[PDB]
Amino acid sequence: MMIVIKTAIPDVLILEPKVFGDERGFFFESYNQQTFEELIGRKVTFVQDNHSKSKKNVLRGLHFQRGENAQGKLVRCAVGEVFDVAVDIRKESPTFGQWVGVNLSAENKRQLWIPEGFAHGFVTLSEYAEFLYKATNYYSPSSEGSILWNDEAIGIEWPFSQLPELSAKDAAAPLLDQALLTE
């Protein structure tokens, strides 16, 4: 079964499959369309599944897509562990600029549902981590959007002390205010 836990930000949900641990190994339903729509309360279609691998300390993110390319993301960690983050970037939201951080691992099986209107990011905590994520809309480069990981306005408390290994693109990400200029 799956336990659904709300986070400090209402629309962001943690899903936790409680799994067997049998003799052959285990087996669980990681996603179920009818169930998920009933949980969220509205129709939701995932059109794209992605799978990525990263080394310890690689931080990916604070990504989002604008307007009609806005993507809802249901993510989890197939291998290792990451510290996942969701930032509410809806200017009209009571929780705008607020963030939620959750540890997702192959062991705990947690998932994080991040609706459209949020930016996402995560850091690899284990030697390597394999991240899976489903999206409500296709990734389209022309729509990309990013926010610097250590932006003070948001003030995420990242579990690490070292500087994260960032991609050239994420290291050059603008601060919250700039980032949302035309949004």
Nearer to its own copies, 19 or 175 (CB): 19
CB atoms near residue 2 (< 10 Å): 18
In 3D space, the residue among 58, 31, 55, 59 whose CA is nearest the CA of residue 133 turns out to be 31
Site for its own copies in 49-68 (CB under 8 A): 49-55, 58, 60
To its own copies, the closest distance from the beta carbon of 157 in angstroms equals 23
Least distance from C-beta 31 to its own copies, angstroms? 4
Q: Candidates 90, 95, 158, 165: give the one binding its own copies (CB under 8 A).
A: 165
DSSP 68: G
Query: Least distance from C-beta 11 to its own copies, angstroms?
Result: 22
Largest CA distance in the chain: 55
CB contact burial 146-156 (16+ within 10 A = b; e otherwise): bbbbebeebeb
* Interface with its own copies in residues 11-50 (CB under 8 A): 21, 24-34, 45-50
CA triple 139-127-124, angle to 5 deg: 35
User: According to CB under 8 A, which residues from 116 to 135 bind its own copies?
Assistant: 128, 130, 132, 134
50 in a known ligand binding site: yes
Whether 32 has a binding-site annotation, put simply, is: no
The residue behind tokens 């129709």 is 43
Nearest to 56 by CA among 130, 111, 151: 130
- Least distance to its own copies, CB of residue 142, Å: 17
Tell me how crowded residue 52 is: count the other CB atoms within 10 A of its CB. 13
Residue 145 has which token pair?
């959007």
95/132 with CB nearer its own copies? 132
Please identify every residue annotated as catalytic: 63, 133
Q: Which residues are annotated as a binding site for substrate?
A: 24, 29, 48-50, 60, 73, 120, 144, 169
Contacts with its own copies, residue ranges (CB under 8 A): 21, 24-34, 45-55, 58, 60, 78-79, 128, 130, 132, 134, 138-139, 165, 167
